[PDB]
Amino acid sequence: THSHGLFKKLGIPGPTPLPFLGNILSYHKGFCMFDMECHKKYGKVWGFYDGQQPVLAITDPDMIKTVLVKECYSVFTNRRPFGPVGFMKSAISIAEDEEWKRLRSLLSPTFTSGKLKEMVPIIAQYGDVLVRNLRREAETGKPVTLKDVFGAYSMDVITSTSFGVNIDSLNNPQDPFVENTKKFDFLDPFFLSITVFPFLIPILEVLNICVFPREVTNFLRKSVKRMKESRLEDFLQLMIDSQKALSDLELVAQSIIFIFAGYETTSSVLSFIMYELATHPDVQQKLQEEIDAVLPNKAPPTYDTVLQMEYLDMVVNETLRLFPIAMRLERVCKKDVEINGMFIPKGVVVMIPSYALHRDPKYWTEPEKFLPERFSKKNKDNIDPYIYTPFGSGPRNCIGMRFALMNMKLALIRVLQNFSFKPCKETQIPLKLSLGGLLQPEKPVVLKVESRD
Amino acid sequence: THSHGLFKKLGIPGPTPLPFLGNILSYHKGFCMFDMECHKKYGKVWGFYDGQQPVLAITDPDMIKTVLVKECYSVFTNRRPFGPVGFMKSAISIAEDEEWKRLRSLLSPTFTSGKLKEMVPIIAQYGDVLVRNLRREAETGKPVTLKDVFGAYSMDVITSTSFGVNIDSLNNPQDPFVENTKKFDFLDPFFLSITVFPFLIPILEVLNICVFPREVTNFLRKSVKRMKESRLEDFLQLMIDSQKALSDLELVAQSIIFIFAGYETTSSVLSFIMYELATHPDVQQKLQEEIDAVLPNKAPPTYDTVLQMEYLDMVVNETLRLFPIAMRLERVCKKDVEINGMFIPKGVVVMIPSYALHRDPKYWTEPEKFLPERFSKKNKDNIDPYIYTPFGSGPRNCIGMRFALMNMKLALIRVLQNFSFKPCKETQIPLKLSLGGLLQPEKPVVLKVESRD
Ligand code: HEM
Ligand code: HEM
Ligand SMILES: CC(C)(C)OC(=O)N[C@@H](CS[C@@H](Cc1ccccc1)C(=O)NCCc1cccnc1)Cc1c[nH]c2ccccc12
Ligand SMILES: CC(C)(C)OC(=O)N[C@@H](CS[C@@H](Cc1ccccc1)C(=O)NCCc1cccnc1)Cc1c[nH]c2ccccc12
């Protein structure tokens, strides 16, 4: 436990670390509550130890921008390593340094205005599928779980945009391309034990053990294999028309990330939005009127249409403030440097507590409140872009931001053009966040669902 | 590698062990071929090292009987430990010493003549289900995979005899009690690495890591929980009417063993029998005539009926000779002893190569040949019961032998009363055993299936 003296030696405040454990015991109410408290009592900057691993939390907007934007390329290029990952070492959000910049550049042109617009008609054909699957249980007239219906849609949109495999996942709880997809709590019996035994990570790699257990990976290594080639002899088509090289084992890796980034993220965030609309009927009514004014006769949405609806964009943005699913942003400092006057030694994980910053009184009137008006053009300047970062910032931000926004909103428009949502008995008000290690509802989101004519 | 001198020090022949690896590299053609060769060139007794773990192979019938029967209770009580197993430490085939004898005695009355006879009508109702599912693909007229149809049946018979949950598993590739059940190669990237790093086993236990990965276990911990009690407020009923205590976490453990012991074992052995019948039509015809003579008009079988058909018992026994799915029997020596004149130090795993002994010319005319006549009452005395041990022997033999025999034969009778089996093009002749670490067909068993009227 010789590494625990670093934050007194640097004169930086923080909770006292226990031997070997560090501050991990302070995670008993999730990263979010521990960040909000630390912020409230330690101020602009503090430190703590994930095991032996020092973690410096910063909150200065000039400092955050130095880490995310300015000195990203030179100093803060990687996220904190975690394992074991096996062949997934080559995935973009996990890769580091020069083979990240290789993958980041190779994969950036997959989320371009021209390519995103070229996906509107394809996934608009699933918005319709979302409607009929949702109409059936509107006459059922008993509470509806959104994570499952949104999952099916978001999954349907992923499979299609990723491999062209068109399936009604709700009505097909079966077929091979939806079974494995159904198959990371940083605080379960396991990931706690790898922050207390980070020295055990090389042991599990030698054992080919993977946190992505090798039953799902093997399905796709061949599901892509035959469909790489002898099934067509789309993110995939846009990676083979360039297959700075790109191995086919490295091609499977990015496919998995895209699939999880946008099935759990897209549906979790869509569930948080329908909760906030159902417990704020005022907003729901305001949004149904904006949608119908841009799209008369329940018209099909287009790329240009969606960038226009700005109360819809206002609603999405505020939900992300209250529920930024990443919670934190993390960069590993690559060398002895000194930003904003303070000194950062080699190896420290520099951390940014997105959740807590999204709820700081020193920036947000009525923090816990759901006020989509904060983001209207009248007020969307009193908002620091380095305090509101649900997609990160800088070269290593969310490569799928524009697609995530565009997909969620297309789901929202076609859904609100036809249905409305009311709180139930099982409906939890106010929603309590997970005690665990990600940002999901403690109890699933289930609501009343009526229909218009 | 200080432990590798033990077999020169004892003056016992064997292959020379490499540092750290031992003789594991000699497993490149399965345990079976390595046992047959060692036997052929080293004789009655030899030794080798699974990593640092010395393993003494014996073949004397008086010696085998001393280890399995005489000094089982005092010296050779456990099988060689393997892990990580988590809560499955309390399962009977894994438990050791005084808590094994507790579980062995507590669970023995579940396989009694009176209880086995009380299962005939229940599983005879599934023999019928086996027929109709098999009739459909008799008119299809294209090769039939037996492991899948036998799996469904054997599974149907397990679920019912274990929890009363009656399901058509082939026609239900779905329901929760058949999904997880579908979910151990001692030679994959993993189990090789735990015989070279047996010192890493305590590491994975600390991590709650299990070779029974915790997705299946958790289903049953609660699937039994509510059906323990508030679903009826059968092996299960026969364990709760006594729930020397028996914890409920220990109750889930035995349930898993029974389920795997008799879904993969019962269906693997049934697939080996239909292969041997289809490539020996003579025997198949001889068996169809014995069945029809005991059971006229395709009559339903009974407990007394099955013990009577002795060519059927002859066919089963010979298949087990050629394919004894356990391959080896193993006991861990608990103290310095000296049996049959030779000296056994503390800690050595004493091993018996069932497969190779089942194919030894010094006991078996035409070893590779399928001659069910070896087991007729005319010849079933020229057969040493410590050379033919498909169910082991002694206090720690197969507790489910009588049930396994009774179940397989009931499957065989109702099937042969209605169908016949012929070799195909994809049919592999002769069958080649798995290069891997268990005894299964290298390529699945698929055969032509006709029908009688
Ligand atoms: C509501 C939806 C989403 C949210 C809120 C979100 C948020 C984030 C955040 C905060 C980061 C970290 C940024 C940083 O470190 O500064 C990130 C990274 C990333 N996201 Fe997203 N994301 C979403 C959807 C998606 C989708 C749909 C995809 C892909 C199809 C995606 C792909 C990625 C990738 C690849 C990275 C790692 C980037 C890198 O390391 O270079 N995300 N996301
Ligand atoms: C064709 C079917 C089967 C074969 C060939 C077979 C064979 C064997 C063999 C060779 C052993 C080791 C005996 C020894 O160590 O000397 C064994 C152990 C065992 N078998 Fe079976 N078995 C079969 C089916 C079953 C079934 C259906 C069950 C349970 C329902 C079962 C339960 C067990 C148990 C619990 C043990 C461990 C006994 C102990 O450690 O006390 N087996 N089996
Ligand atoms: C919701 C969230 C992001 C907070 O937790 C997650 O469940 N996922 C982790 C684990 S890692 C992995 C994702 C994964 C997880 C389970 C099974 C397969 C793959 C990966 O390779 N990619 C992440 C894809 C993604 C998710 C959300 C937004 N965009 C991109 C944490 C994490 C991974 N990448 C990050 C980037 C920034 C901040 C946090 C993370
Ligand atoms: C076919 C065989 C027996 C050679 O390989 C096996 O796949 N199973 C191993 C692993 S262990 C486990 C079984 C298990 C395996 C996978 C998933 C869950 C549980 C256990 O707890 N019970 C074994 C039940 C059984 C199987 C066959 C006959 N009777 C009883 C080896 C093994 C376990 N027990 C033995 C007893 C004697 C000889 C070998 C073994």
Short mmCIF file of N, CA and C and ligand atoms in Angstrom, two decimals, chain B residues 79 82 88 91-94 183-186 211-212 256-258 260-262 264-265 324-331 398 437-439, ligand 4:
data_model
loop_
_atom_site.label_atom_id
_atom_site.label_comp_id
_atom_site.label_asym_id
_atom_site.label_seq_id
_atom_site.Cartn_x
_atom_site.Cartn_y
_atom_site.Cartn_z
N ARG B 79 -12.14 -38.59 -5.68
CA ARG B 79 -11.61 -38.44 -7.03
C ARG B 79 -10.70 -37.24 -7.05
N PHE B 82 -10.98 -31.09 -8.92
CA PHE B 82 -10.90 -30.15 -10.02
C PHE B 82 -11.76 -28.94 -9.70
N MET B 88 -20.86 -25.74 -6.06
CA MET B 88 -20.91 -27.14 -6.45
C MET B 88 -19.89 -28.00 -5.72
N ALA B 91 -21.62 -31.15 -4.32
CA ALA B 91 -22.20 -32.19 -5.16
C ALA B 91 -21.52 -33.53 -4.91
N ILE B 92 -22.27 -34.61 -5.12
CA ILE B 92 -21.86 -35.91 -4.60
C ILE B 92 -20.60 -36.41 -5.31
N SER B 93 -20.58 -36.35 -6.64
CA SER B 93 -19.41 -36.84 -7.37
C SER B 93 -18.18 -35.97 -7.15
N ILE B 94 -18.36 -34.79 -6.55
CA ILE B 94 -17.24 -33.91 -6.25
C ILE B 94 -16.88 -33.91 -4.77
N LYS B 183 -27.67 -25.52 -22.24
CA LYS B 183 -26.38 -24.94 -21.88
C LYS B 183 -25.57 -25.93 -21.04
N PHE B 184 -17.58 -31.55 -20.21
CA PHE B 184 -16.38 -30.81 -19.83
C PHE B 184 -15.12 -31.34 -20.50
N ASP B 185 -14.75 -30.72 -21.62
CA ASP B 185 -13.54 -31.10 -22.35
C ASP B 185 -12.35 -30.86 -21.43
N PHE B 186 -11.75 -31.94 -20.91
CA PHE B 186 -10.58 -31.83 -20.05
C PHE B 186 -9.34 -31.38 -20.82
N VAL B 211 -16.61 -23.26 -13.24
CA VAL B 211 -16.68 -23.99 -14.51
C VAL B 211 -18.12 -24.30 -14.88
N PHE B 212 -19.03 -24.24 -13.91
CA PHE B 212 -20.46 -24.15 -14.14
C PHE B 212 -20.81 -22.67 -14.10
N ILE B 256 -28.35 -30.55 -10.22
CA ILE B 256 -27.61 -30.30 -11.44
C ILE B 256 -26.90 -31.56 -11.92
N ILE B 257 -26.29 -32.30 -10.99
CA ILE B 257 -25.56 -33.51 -11.37
C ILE B 257 -26.50 -34.51 -12.03
N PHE B 258 -27.59 -34.85 -11.34
CA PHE B 258 -28.58 -35.74 -11.93
C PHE B 258 -28.97 -35.29 -13.33
N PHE B 260 -27.31 -33.31 -15.67
CA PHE B 260 -26.27 -33.62 -16.65
C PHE B 260 -25.88 -35.09 -16.77
N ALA B 261 -25.88 -35.80 -15.64
CA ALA B 261 -25.69 -37.25 -15.61
C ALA B 261 -26.99 -37.87 -16.07
N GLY B 262 -27.19 -38.03 -17.37
CA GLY B 262 -28.42 -38.67 -17.78
C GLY B 262 -29.17 -37.92 -18.86
N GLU B 264 -26.67 -36.05 -21.10
CA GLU B 264 -25.59 -36.17 -22.07
C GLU B 264 -25.17 -37.64 -22.05
N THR B 265 -25.15 -38.27 -20.87
CA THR B 265 -24.74 -39.67 -20.80
C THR B 265 -25.78 -40.58 -21.42
N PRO B 324 -17.02 -46.74 -23.24
CA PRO B 324 -17.27 -46.41 -21.83
C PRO B 324 -17.03 -44.93 -21.54
N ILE B 325 -18.10 -44.14 -21.55
CA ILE B 325 -18.04 -42.68 -21.67
C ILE B 325 -17.16 -42.01 -20.63
N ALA B 326 -16.92 -42.67 -19.50
CA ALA B 326 -16.04 -42.14 -18.47
C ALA B 326 -14.57 -42.26 -18.85
N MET B 327 -14.20 -43.27 -19.66
CA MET B 327 -12.85 -43.48 -20.17
C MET B 327 -11.98 -44.00 -19.03
N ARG B 328 -11.78 -43.19 -17.98
CA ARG B 328 -11.01 -43.58 -16.82
C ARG B 328 -11.81 -43.54 -15.52
N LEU B 329 -11.31 -44.27 -14.54
CA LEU B 329 -11.75 -44.14 -13.16
C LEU B 329 -10.56 -43.66 -12.33
N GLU B 330 -10.82 -42.80 -11.36
CA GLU B 330 -9.75 -42.15 -10.62
C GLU B 330 -10.07 -42.12 -9.14
N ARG B 331 -9.07 -42.39 -8.30
CA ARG B 331 -9.16 -42.23 -6.86
C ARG B 331 -7.89 -41.58 -6.36
N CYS B 398 -21.36 -45.81 -9.89
CA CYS B 398 -22.39 -44.94 -10.45
C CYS B 398 -23.70 -45.14 -9.72
N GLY B 437 -11.37 -34.57 -25.31
CA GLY B 437 -11.15 -35.08 -23.97
C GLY B 437 -12.32 -35.80 -23.32
N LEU B 438 -13.39 -36.02 -24.08
CA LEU B 438 -14.45 -36.90 -23.63
C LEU B 438 -14.68 -37.94 -24.72
N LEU B 439 -15.61 -38.85 -24.46
CA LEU B 439 -15.90 -39.93 -25.39
C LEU B 439 -17.25 -39.64 -26.05
C1 LIG C 4 -19.13 -37.96 -19.83
C2 LIG C 4 -18.12 -37.68 -18.68
C3 LIG C 4 -18.72 -38.13 -17.33
C4 LIG C 4 -16.90 -38.58 -18.97
O1 LIG C 4 -17.65 -36.32 -18.59
C5 LIG C 4 -18.52 -35.31 -18.22
O2 LIG C 4 -18.92 -34.53 -19.08
N1 LIG C 4 -18.49 -35.00 -16.85
C6 LIG C 4 -17.19 -34.65 -16.18
C7 LIG C 4 -17.22 -33.25 -15.27
S1 LIG C 4 -17.85 -33.24 -13.48
C8 LIG C 4 -19.78 -33.02 -13.36
C9 LIG C 4 -20.48 -33.25 -14.73
C10 LIG C 4 -20.90 -32.04 -15.48
C11 LIG C 4 -20.33 -31.74 -16.73
C12 LIG C 4 -20.72 -30.59 -17.44
C13 LIG C 4 -21.69 -29.72 -16.91
C14 LIG C 4 -22.27 -30.02 -15.66
C15 LIG C 4 -21.88 -31.16 -14.94
C16 LIG C 4 -20.43 -33.85 -12.11
O3 LIG C 4 -20.56 -33.37 -10.99
N2 LIG C 4 -20.86 -35.19 -12.22
C17 LIG C 4 -20.82 -36.01 -13.44
C18 LIG C 4 -22.16 -36.66 -13.78
C19 LIG C 4 -22.07 -38.00 -14.42
C20 LIG C 4 -21.66 -38.10 -15.76
C21 LIG C 4 -21.54 -39.36 -16.35
C22 LIG C 4 -21.85 -40.49 -15.57
N3 LIG C 4 -22.26 -40.41 -14.27
C23 LIG C 4 -22.35 -39.19 -13.71
C24 LIG C 4 -16.44 -35.93 -15.53
C25 LIG C 4 -16.98 -36.74 -14.41
C26 LIG C 4 -17.82 -36.26 -13.42
N4 LIG C 4 -18.13 -37.29 -12.52
C27 LIG C 4 -17.46 -38.43 -12.91
C28 LIG C 4 -17.48 -39.66 -12.27
C29 LIG C 4 -16.72 -40.64 -12.84
C30 LIG C 4 -15.97 -40.41 -14.01
C31 LIG C 4 -15.95 -39.18 -14.65
C32 LIG C 4 -16.71 -38.14 -14.09
#
